[PDB]
Amino acid sequence: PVEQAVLETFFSHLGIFSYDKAKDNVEKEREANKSAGGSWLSLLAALAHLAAAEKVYHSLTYLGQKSIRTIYTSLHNELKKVVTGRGALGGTAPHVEELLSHLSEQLCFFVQARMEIADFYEKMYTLSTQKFINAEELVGLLDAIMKKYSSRFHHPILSPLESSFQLEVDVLCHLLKAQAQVSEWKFLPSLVNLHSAHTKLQTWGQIFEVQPPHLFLWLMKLKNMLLAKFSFYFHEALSRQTTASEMKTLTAKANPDFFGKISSFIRKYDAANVSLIFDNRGFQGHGYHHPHSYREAPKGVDQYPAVVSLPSDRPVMHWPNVIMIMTDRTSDLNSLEKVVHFYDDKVQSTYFLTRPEPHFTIVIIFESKKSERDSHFISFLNEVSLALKNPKVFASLKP
Amino acid sequence: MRSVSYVQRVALEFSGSLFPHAICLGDVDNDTLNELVVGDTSGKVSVYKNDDSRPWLTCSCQGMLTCVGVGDVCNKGKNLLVAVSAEGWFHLFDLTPEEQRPVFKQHIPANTKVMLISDIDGDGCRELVVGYTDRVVRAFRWEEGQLVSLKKWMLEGQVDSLSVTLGPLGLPELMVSQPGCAYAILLCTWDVVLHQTIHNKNVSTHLIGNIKQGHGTESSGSGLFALCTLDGTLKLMEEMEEADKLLWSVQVDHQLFALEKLDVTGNGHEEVVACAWDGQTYIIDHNRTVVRFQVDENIRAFCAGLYACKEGRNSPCLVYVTFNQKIYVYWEVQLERMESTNLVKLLETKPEYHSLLQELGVDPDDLPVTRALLHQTLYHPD
């Protein structure tokens, strides 16, 4: 196909970001390659405008407050009326002229899927104020687009974009599922989803040979925060398989490293403990367990497992008043923005506490009065919580 | 055909039961004088010597006795007493200068019934042959020492007696009685051939052999053997050449259970003596002359042979075992003759009588004349 020889390269150059270069061949075909069937120029202009549309898409700065719907949907008659059946003299012989019809239908499906994904991103942005991002609803909503659009464009000419699209879909799902699974303490499911996302990313990503569009950078940012979020939660089940001075070299390699902060803090200020509690949300144990094993149901004071407790084991003689305080003022901390304070006499401990996440809650303890007005500690807890909640992580989706 | 009444007799006390083959006579102390050896089931053997009613000596062996004998089994030029029990025990006694313990013991297979001591092959060493109730015959030899098994013959009918006789060729043989009045030749031990002779074929049969025929021929000579049946028939034949010539046979009306050889006349020939359960003893020579003797008593065991009873002298003797715990020994069974004759037909053989009658002028033709002459010569010397 001499006519499609140019089109093959023009479309295949879009696998990597080559929108500016892709435009140039269209300009050449517009007038230099004149006297042709009146569908080639139409599809050339359509693809040229598609290049700018996708550039705006990848920019992910064109949709913060809308536009990003009109320009998006500004090619439906274009794509559909690109083909016009047959008629008077056009371009080549009536042998491969009607090859663009399948591509046009696939591109109509492309446009529809892109618009729905854009509405998806806008919905996420709008929801990204709240007080906690329920990942289960987002997962329940995203599967619809993937299911409906799956296998809706194929004429062995559009594999790259599809793959890219697939990546742009597939990657996200895992992280959100991870974002889901981690919120509910799923060790292996979250880990597998995250690793599959990492593996799938590299090929369509790191193989670039310009600065990746903000969409890519936010994906990287989200994964990178998820790594540290993942690392903190399971640290007490990961310290076992290595050496105390060995895991430092890795835990210092997470961009928002949490482990170092508390260890430094205990040295900086004579303390008693620091712990992270996870109520069972209405539960095998530490690590991976059998496909179906005997799990004795939670009973007694066991819905409050100290998942992580930094210096030594959790004080037995100092955990009767942590599930007294936990429910004794169990209203304010559910607003996820305040920190509790109790100073007593015969325990001499000040139990600061904040709720970064609905299920999880951090706590410290001292050996004397702490003077709640002392902002030294409160700032640390605020700073710590500012990252776990993923408020900035969800918010920063458009520069 | 004529009856006799022996009077002289010795009674020996003996309490206990025994088999018919558990009594014998022979020299045990090596003094050329025979002594009686009797073994009972109770595990004791008594020897009787001379005329003492009490036994000379009692020797005890472990088990129940089934066979006794006296002979040269060790082949060291001496006579020894052999005792064989039912469990296949074997005891040797040297009663030659207070039970006498044996000086040897050896275990053989059990179910022993009959014993025999003779040189069967002819190597110069005497062999021991033992019969069994399960129709088995087993020969042995003394090896300097113990007993070495030789051969083991199998038979169909029950065995009742073992005998050795001079074969047609001139070598010793081995005869075994067989029911139905039959006998088997056993090939010597270095397979078994049968011969028949007319009634119920399950009748017990006893055999005897090695019958003497002349004086001084006991060193090496045989050829005649006798068969007896429980239904009451006797027979003498000769085992010469190919066919066994039939010498004689008699039919009686008693239950015959014994067969021995004796010498009552003293002319060298041996007479066959048989006994019945009721005690009707028969003595028959080789010339069809029967002599009857009725003891009028039920008899357990019988034994005819040489014995030293009075003043150290071997004489023919008959021995019966009675149910009254007694053993009867007749010692003067010697007979001047065996047929019946007179003076007239005994003087008609020597030629001197005829010569004297011719010299006297009286012709030995008128019986009354010679009868009167003999009467005058005997009862009227002057």
Binding site: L191, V192, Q241, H290 | G63, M64, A86, T133, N200
Partner: protein, 815 residues
């Protein structure tokens, strides 16, 4: 007034005669003494002053005055007085003229005087030969108060020795002071030549028709220098008639003189007490009467000894003398009391008809012994005649004595014995086995028509079988280490009983019974439910000994036995080690062990039931250099036992045996070749927990399951780079070098690594990679074929810890 004349020869005999006279008048007259006679007459007499007949012809006289009233017969009174005087004179003459006469260095002289007084040696005095006898016979015509007489005849005279002892014993019994002498006449002389004889000489006169005499004199020897004193203590009728004063005494000495002329006794008792003397005479007459009544040997023994039973029988009344019949000759004869103890006690006509064996106690004693021998024969004959009809027709526990009589009346026909092989010493519980054997044989014997013989109160058993010909008896007993049976016969045309004994002898079958019993016991012990034999019994040695003893398969047995030896290759492991392993895991191979007995060996047993019209119980037993160690030599036995029958078959290699042994050989070979691997696998598995070829050798035969087949969540691990596996291996090697058994290749183009936990010995977990092809894997290894799930707990912990580092490896690849 009357007077009587007296001879002058008694001129000085006045003191004696008067002494006699006072006695003589004392009898007829009851008290110059006054006497009263009852006509009634009073008599007063006074003596005054003045060849047998001359000396007593009736010179002092006697004057008497009698006052008679009524018919007193004065002439008769005078005659009586004269007779009394004459009798007194005769008595005095006899007393003083004959009684004092003797009957017949210093020590020797006194010895003859004693020998003459008692007179056993010497000669008789002339007085006691002719004079005395005639005198005492003559003073019997003249009425005197001291006289006796008796007479007898007897049918023979050999009774004399049989009367001479009885009479002296009798006289001694009635008179202590008496002695008897037996002076016999010398049979050449006569005029007082009486030669004393010794007590024991029987009859020293073989000559018949000889009129032997006897002089049986009896006198109290202590009556001399003694008639003055009281004598005999009232035994003598008289005493000194007058008075013993004035130094004069009458010879009141008594006497006794018996005499015989051929055959005629005659007593002459003098001075015996009247009643006692009359009783003495009566006793002698009765003694002779009894001796003569003891003449029936002559009648019905001596006569019948020569076939004369019809000529001289019993109670035939021999001789009809009408003197005083014969008290002992009555129809009621005490025959047994007259041939023994000759005395007058205080069919017989055919006695000796056809029986073969002091003459009185010599001729009938053999008759008594003959009559007793018949009773002894008769009792014995009834004792062996009631039993025959009792046992034959009727269908009582005969005692020991009856059994002994039956055995001594029977003949021994046949016997047989068998060997008891359970006892090692004959190569508490053995007694029980012997009792069971005996009981089973008793059952077999009663099943063929025999009746057990009970024994009433006073382990041998007796069984009988009554037949018209006679009684056949058996005896079962244990004698040492052998079981023996004896057969007795007792005949009661005459050859059918012999046939009956022969046929029963042919049905004995002891050897076949022992064969069946031994094989049945072997089978029962093989199951082990019937623990008859003692524990630790060497069954293989017992089987070998039994086969050696019966290597021919006794004729009418029903059970069968076979022995064979199996040699197996066993090339990999040692033969003895394989045998030990199979014995240890015998339960896994449908086999059972046996602890035969301080060395202990183990034998393998098995059994099943095969009914191929056979219905046979099948028993199988198996027991045990470098080439020898590579050869599994094991000898095995096959035992077949019947179910229904237990007794030897009455009528007359083995297909069942060969059929069983074929598949037995096949199954043994299959089991060996299958169990070799089951041992090889499990041997070095244990060694693993301490080689690469050894490591691969297991994986050929182990049940291993992939991680993708236990939990699908692990499926992600199946599709990642080998470098991740290398990282994993390094982490585990650093973490559990104790549990990590790393294996390499001498090309380093394949590695095997495993990790166990000691306690969970059931399964370890291995990784695998080739690094050339990239064929990396991951599996979990299970030695056994783990059966099922629903429709292992300690297994997932390996799947926990091992997977618990798989994620740690993943985490490091993301930080």
């Amino acid at each position: 007034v009357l007077h009587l004349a007296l001879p002058t020869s008694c001129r000085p005999w006045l003191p004696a005669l008067a002494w006699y006279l006072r006695q003589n008048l004392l009898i007829f007259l009851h008290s110059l003494d006054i006497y009263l006679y009852n006509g009634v007459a009073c008599i007063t007499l006074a003596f005054v002053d003045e060849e047998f007949e001359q000396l007593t012809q009736v010179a002092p006289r006697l004057r008497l005055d009698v006052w008679e009233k009524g018919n007193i017969s004065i002439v008769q009174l005078e005659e009586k007085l004269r007779g009394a005087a004459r009798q007194a004179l005769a008595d005095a003459i006899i007393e003083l003229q004959l009684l004092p006469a003797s009957l017949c260095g210093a020590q020797r002289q006194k010895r003859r005087t004693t020998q003459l007084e008692e007179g056993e040696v010497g000669t008789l005095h002339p007085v006691f030969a002719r004079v005395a006898q005639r005198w005492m016979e003559f003073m019997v015509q003249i009425g005197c108060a001291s006289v006796s007489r008796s007479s007898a005849h007897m049918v023979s005279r050999f009774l004399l020795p049989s009367i001479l002892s009885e009479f002296t014993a009798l006289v001694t019994s009635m008179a202590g002071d008496t002695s008897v002498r037996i002076f016999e006449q010398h049979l050449g002389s006569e005029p007082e030549i009486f030669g004393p004889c010794s007590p024991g000489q029987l009859g020293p006169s073989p000559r018949p028709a000889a009129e032997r005499h006897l002089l049986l004199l009896g006198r109290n020897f202590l009556q001399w220098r003694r008639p003055t004193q009281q004598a005999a203590k009232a035994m003598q009728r008289f005493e000194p008639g007058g008075d013993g004063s004035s130094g004069r005494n009458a010879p009141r000495q008594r006497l006794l003189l018996l005499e015989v002329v051929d055959k005629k006794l005659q007593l002459l008792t003098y001075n015996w007490a009247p009643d006692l003397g009359a009783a003495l005479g009566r006793a002698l007459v009765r003694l002779v009467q009894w001796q003569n009544a003891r003449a029936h040997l002559i009648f019905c023994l001596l006569s019948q000894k020569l076939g004369l039973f019809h000529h001289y029988g019993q109670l035939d009344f021999p001789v009809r003398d009408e003197k005083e019949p014969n008290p002992f000759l009555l129809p009621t004869m005490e025959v047994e009391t007259l041939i023994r103890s000759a005395s007058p006690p205080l069919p017989f006509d055919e006695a000796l008809r056809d029986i073969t064996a002091d003459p009185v106690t010599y001729h009938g004693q053999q008759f008594l012994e003959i009559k007793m021998a018949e009773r002894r024969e008769l009792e014995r004959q009834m004792k062996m005649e009631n039993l025959f009809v009792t046992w034959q027709q009727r269908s009582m526990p005969i005692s020991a004595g009856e059994l002994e009589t039956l055995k001594q009346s029977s003949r021994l026909v046949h016997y047989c014995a068998t060997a008891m092989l359970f006892d090692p010493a004959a190569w508490p519980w053995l007694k029980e086995l012997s009792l069971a054997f005996l009981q089973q044989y008793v059952q077999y014997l009663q099943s063929i028509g025999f009746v057990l013989v009970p024994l009433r109160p006073p382990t041998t058993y007796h069984l009988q079988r009554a037949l018209p010909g006679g009684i056949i008896l058996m005896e079962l007993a244990f004698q040492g280490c052998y079981f023996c049976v004896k057969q007795f016969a007792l005949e009661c045309l005459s050859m059918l009983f012999t046939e009956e004994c022969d046929k029963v002898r042919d049905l004995m079958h002891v050897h076949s019974f022992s064969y069946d019993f031994h094989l049945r016991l072997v089978h029962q012990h093989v199951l082990g439910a019937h623990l008859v034999l003692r524990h630790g019994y060497h069954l293989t040695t017992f089987l070998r000994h039994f086969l050696a003893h019966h290597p021919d398969g006794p004729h009418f047995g029903r059970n069968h036995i076979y022995q064979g030896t199996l040699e197996l290759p066993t090339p990999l492991i040692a033969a003895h080690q394989l045998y030990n392993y199979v014995a240890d895991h015998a339960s896994s191979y449908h086999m059972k062990p046996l602890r035969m007995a301080e060395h202990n060996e183990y034998a393998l047993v098995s059994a099943w039931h095969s009914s191929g019209q056979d219905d046979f119980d099948v028993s199988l037993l198996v027991c045990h250099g470098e080439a020898e160690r590579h050869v599994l030599r094991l000898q095995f036995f096959v035992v077949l036992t019947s179910q229904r029958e237990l007794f030897p078959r009455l009528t007359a290699l083995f297909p069942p045996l060969a059929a069983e042994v074929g598949m037995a050989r096949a199954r043994l070979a299959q089991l060996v070749r299958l169990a070799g691997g089951h041992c090889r696998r499990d041997t070095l598995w244990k060694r693993l927990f301490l080689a690469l070829a050894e490591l691969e050798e297991l994986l050929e035969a182990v049940h291993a399951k992939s991680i993708g087949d236990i939990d699908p969540q692990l499926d992600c691990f199946l599709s990642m780079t080998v470098s991740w596996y290398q990282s994993l291996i390094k982490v585990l090697l650093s973490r559990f070098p104790q549990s990590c058994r790393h294996f390499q290749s001498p090309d380093l183009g394949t590695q095997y690594l495993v990790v166990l936990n000691q306690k969970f010995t059931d399964c370890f977990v291995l990784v695998f990679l080739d690094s050339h092809l990239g064929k990396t894997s991951l599996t979990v290894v299970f030695r056994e074929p783990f059966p099922v799930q629903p429709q292992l707990v300690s297994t997932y912990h390996h799947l926990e810890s091992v997977i618990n580092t798989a994620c740690f490896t993943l985490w490091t690849r993301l930080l």
